[PDB]
Amino acid sequence: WKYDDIKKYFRRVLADISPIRDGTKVNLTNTILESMRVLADQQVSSGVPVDFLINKATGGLPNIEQTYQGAPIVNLNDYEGINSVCGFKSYYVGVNQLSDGSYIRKYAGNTYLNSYYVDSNGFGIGKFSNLRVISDAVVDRIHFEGQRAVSVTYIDKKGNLHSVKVHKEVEICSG
Amino acid sequence: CPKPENLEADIVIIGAGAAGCVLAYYLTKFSDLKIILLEAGHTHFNDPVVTDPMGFFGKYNPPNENIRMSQNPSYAWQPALEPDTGAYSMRNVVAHGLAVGGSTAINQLNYIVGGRTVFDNDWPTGWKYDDIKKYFRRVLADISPIRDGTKVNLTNTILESMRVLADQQVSSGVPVDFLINKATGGLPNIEQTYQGAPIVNLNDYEGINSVCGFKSYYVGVNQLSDGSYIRKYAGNTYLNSYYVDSNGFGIGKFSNLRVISDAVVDRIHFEGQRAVSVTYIDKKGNLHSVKVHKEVEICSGSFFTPTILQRSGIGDFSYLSSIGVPDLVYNNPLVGQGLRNHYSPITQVSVTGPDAAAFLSNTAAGPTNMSFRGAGMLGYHKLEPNKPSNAGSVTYRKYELLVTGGVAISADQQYLSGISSSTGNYFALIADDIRFAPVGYIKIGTPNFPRDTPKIFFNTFVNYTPTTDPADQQWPVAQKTLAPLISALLGYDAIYQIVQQMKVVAVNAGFNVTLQMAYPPNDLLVELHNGLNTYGINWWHYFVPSLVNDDTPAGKLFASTLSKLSYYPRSGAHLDSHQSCSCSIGGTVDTELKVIGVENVRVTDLSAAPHPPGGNTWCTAAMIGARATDLILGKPLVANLPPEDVPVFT
Amino acid sequence: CPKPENLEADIVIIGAGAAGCVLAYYLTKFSDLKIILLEAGHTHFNDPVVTDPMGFFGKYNPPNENIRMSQNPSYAWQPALEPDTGAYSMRNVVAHGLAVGGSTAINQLNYIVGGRTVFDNDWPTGWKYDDIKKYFRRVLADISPIRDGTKVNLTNTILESMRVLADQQVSSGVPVDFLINKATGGLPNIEQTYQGAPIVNLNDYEGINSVCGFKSYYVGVNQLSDGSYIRKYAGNTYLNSYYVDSNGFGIGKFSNLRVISDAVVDRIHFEGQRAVSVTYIDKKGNLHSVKVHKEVEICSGSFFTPTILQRSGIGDFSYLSSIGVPDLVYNNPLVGQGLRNHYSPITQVSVTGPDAAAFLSNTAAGPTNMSFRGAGMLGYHKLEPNKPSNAGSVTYRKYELLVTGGVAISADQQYLSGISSSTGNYFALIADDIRFAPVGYIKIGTPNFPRDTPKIFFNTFVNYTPTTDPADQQWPVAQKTLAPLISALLGYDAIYQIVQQMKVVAVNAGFNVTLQMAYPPNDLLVELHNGLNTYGINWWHYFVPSLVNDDTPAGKLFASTLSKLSYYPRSGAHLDSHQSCSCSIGGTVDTELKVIGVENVRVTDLSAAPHPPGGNTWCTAAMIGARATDLILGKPLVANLPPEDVPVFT
């Protein structure tokens, strides 16, 4: 689980979402970035090694985003992880703009489980026909034969206990 | 030819509008027949712009597509009418909703039921008021509208003024003024104005009030336990999650009901004189055919019922053959004829005063008043030559009056007049026509598939061209031609003669303010008032100045003033969306709503009305559908269902 | 499933408009492939209102249905665009013809070919002028238009005046006036005015004339041996009784061609990334499926090509999924984007004189001039900030000027202005925009069947709202937003500064008459002229008065005058019917006209143009279809067909 084993997976998820940046300038950001570069200049000198505005993957130059028109953008979530300390101007939020002009929310259920992939009755569609989703089902515990998990029970929206068999493996993603 | 969509049954109802759902619901409730509904539309139960009543005014509109639901091709059909030769050849687009609930999914939610006199004097036998008033009660009970939830002093002032002048109109013995109701007597029918004053119900069960000044309407909204209002419409009530599955099946009680969401119907496959099948296009683009065993019902609205009939084969054989219809069934040259609609010229009022904000408070729109603050329904003006014979003994509904804050003229007129919507010392008054005269017709243009725009002709404010005929016996065609423009001018005068009683009432109601009509211009109204009271019942000779032979400069003044005034109702007005009377009773159908020349099809939407009712035409279509339930079933069941039995809401 | 209508082939061409017939004809002529054309329309070869050119003006109209062919749902599709936020939210209906020959069956018949510079500076590689000019020659040879057959002295006077002032514009060294052509030099490009003066051909083969003042256009009419003119259009020429049977088969040479008259197409059945079939609805209402072997072609016009694409599966996946499209193929968010069209504000001229009838003679419309009497095509005005970089070295076509007798403003404007069409001392001048700036887009609304009105957005004369930003770097968005209104105002000034040379020319041409612009008002133009010549290139700062900071009463005068003048182009104007650029090159298709993301479909009508040409957009669509013939066939055959080979007429 060292960085070079997973950074590809981070790329995968950020590609699956495609966040956006801020769509509005402001001069307070420019002033604050100006000030931070001003004092990071001194923190670069004086030789002390562990101040809060020193990044070792860049060197003598501060990692502070430039402030003027046509200044490039420092990507916080860069692929090779050079920026662990950096002053920027905007984050990456998980919203998309629709053709109409209204933004919506792009989240896990929105993307991976939407009407195109799963039926309203919980079946997957074609490619994903081997998938079942049950909407309102509170799980209680894992029926467990020997050291081998075998079944799971849950309560539907009557209040009934339904038992389902497991053949191969059980996965827990309950937070 | 493997199409497993075999949806053969005995009843098929086409178009789930203000009348389709009522019929389908109460038809599957009271019997065991297999019912199918086709609408070509999904259910907007979750859309904020639909369910929230205030969404009608564009609260959820994306900033790049600021159009509401009547102008949106995803919500409403968009038919445009051919150039109006009376309105400078300006084509207009009026919509019909495209969803479960029809136009009720996109409308302003008002509940005028119409006067009693109209159903007694203008409808066939079996459709007199006492035959249906129970059905009106049924629908208003099924909705349960509410009243305004906010007082305001402008309503009190205006009602004060109307009672003040109705006092004089009660005297002087003239029988046909616009504030005389004969079912009450010497006392005016004007609602009282003080705390603890009772409320006059406009839609009263026994129809006593055909002329009355009130303070609030009845809109079709409900309040939820949370505190938010929602919209209560036809699809909301009769076809909701409690009654129909998401897959279109009914639930238990109504298990014998089928609803298909997106299915545009084309025409009626028709063996002999017996309708046998119907086809439709789903959302692939496939043609599905379904059998009919027992009867076919058409609830596709005013504009699109005659059209589907004509594609089916019923109409004018010469014409349908001309444009290429291959199969012809019955030769009725009246299909799609006799189209009727309302029309509302607009005027606005200026208030001069340093602190008039105190006068105009509590006028903003809430989901209970929807910007409506009155005021009343009036009768014929004293000086209108086009009145029926019964006017001496029965009071008729002519004008529906409305007051609203802000300005409501069109934007170009706003710029032209010099007054805009930003400033806040201005408000609007509307004198709607309920008995609007002009008549038009509908003709299809291509026998291929249901088209959004067929030929629709509607000419309103036409002019009269004199001939060489002697004046004596050409007047009573000038009368018929100039009826609507005369009506609009008289509405202008009626509104005008209210503002002075309003002046007096405001002066001695604790207000030092001044009221004045600035649109149309002040002078152009004072001159009309003087001309009216100096020329009497022959004031309308002067529309055509070549026949009066009055070359006196006063006569030229009158002619010029009427010429200029004729401009405002043409442009500064608003054609309503109350389309009706396309397949009326007698013209195209009998009194049992069956189509002449065939045994097992009926039309039951608002197109089948033989006259436009006394106000907003929503209750009427639902009433027609409800009565159709009884005529189809045979015995009166919905007739004396107890009023405490209402559909449950989800 | 017994449907014997098995019409499987290898090429299917959809929509026989200005480009469909050319392609089908020259495609079955030069090869042996099995060709099919689908149009959804019958052939109006016999209709007097079509074939007679003068029928365009309503000579055969029944007295009760006085509408011509663009407003008739039996002749033309009727799409309406959403409220124009720049034109007081006035929706407009612009038509596309519905017949063999497309819009050419209902159009005004003009043959502007467009300048040379546009195809050199605005089109991709392979579409520069020298690659296509041969195709323009081919189409103009296939039609053989004619010139005006009637002299008139007003043309002589106006050409006289234009040469008079072009003399001065040639001097003074300024490089970008509107009467300077660089391919001629010091001499003006103004046609001579005397008997035996030669004629300057506007549509010249080598494109020397991009700015030139002439006397007549080239309309697409022919004279018959009898003495009557008829209309020569796409269906008339390429698809007539000599080439196709009444049953839709070709004859001999073209025996490998099929044409189906009434067949509305829905979408493209589409296996994998390979189009395989197409379905359509005949005049029963049946769905017929036909196989495609080799390629599919879309020639359904500007408004209805992106629409059929979107129903087919190509577009914005999120949107098409939203409105319920089940099958999705390629995710191109640019389909139906970049819509372009022309626009022509109107002005009219008063002539004061006792015997001015002698001045205005021989101006009536005949089938050879169709009420067009000139006058020329102009370039950029001196004071327009929105000019390309090449303006210093190449001359661009900006305005197309037209003169016509009578008044042509809309009826409401006629009443408002106080001047009507009865009187005969008045005529109209039109300064059309060819480089009109605003851009819009097209979105379908329901995935069921081809609908007449999809969502069409087109906002033209929008306004700029200043922000708190410092003035210095917010100007170059005000420029982009205010381009078209500036262009219209400059067109007004350009027309205005002609009438004085016309005064002088008339005075010493044997005429004691006076010329004056009465619409827009006289004063409101003199003030604009003074403001222009006193404020220079920074005259357009005053559209927004809150940023000029010029509180001098002169500045307030200028702001008020521009405010008032901004009203006329909004209402007193005429949106043209030149829709184009819905699936342009690069945006949606490559330079070989294939649709990105698929291997065997192309779009070849006017929607595929990456820029609107220099004038009326008829030749351009035919040129695109002709070039498509070559690209499909592979080798240039229509390329050097000898010009003496022309289709025979029947």
Ligand SMILES: Cc1cc2nc3c(=O)[nH]c(=O)nc-3n(C[C@H](O)[C@H](O)[C@H](O)COP(=O)(O)OP(=O)(O)OC[C@H]3O[C@@H](n4cnc5c(N)ncnc54)[C@H](O)[C@@H]3O)c2cc1C
């Ligand atoms: C802008 C607007 C304002 C309004 N304001 C008011 C008001 O102030 N007061 C008031 O009381 N009412 C108002 N209304 C409502 C209107 O007056 C009536 O409610 C209307 O006449 C409903 O009658 P209906 O059910 O017969 O028509 P509709 O509700 O239009 O019924 C037609 C139905 O059939 C469907 N349909 C049509 N063609 C086909 C086809 N080919 N195949 C399948 N289905 C089809 C339509 O989608 C629709 O569901 C307004 C409506 C609109 C649009």
Ligand SMILES: Cc1cc2nc3c(=O)[nH]c(=O)nc-3n(C[C@H](O)[C@H](O)[C@H](O)COP(=O)(O)OP(=O)(O)OC[C@H]3O[C@@H](n4cnc5c(N)ncnc54)[C@H](O)[C@@H]3O)c2cc1C
């Ligand atoms: C009012 C008006 C004025 C005009 N004035 C001029 C002028 O002054 N000068 C000039 O040069 N040109 C003029 N034109 C013509 C116009 O500028 C062009 O000729 C037009 O762009 C033709 O290009 P096109 O062939 O691609 O379009 P179209 O000719 O419209 O081609 C579309 C064809 O496809 C058919 N079609 C559409 N949808 C479908 C479908 N779903 N299924 C099957 N078939 C379908 C249509 O019926 C039509 O036959 C005018 C046109 C109009 C309408």
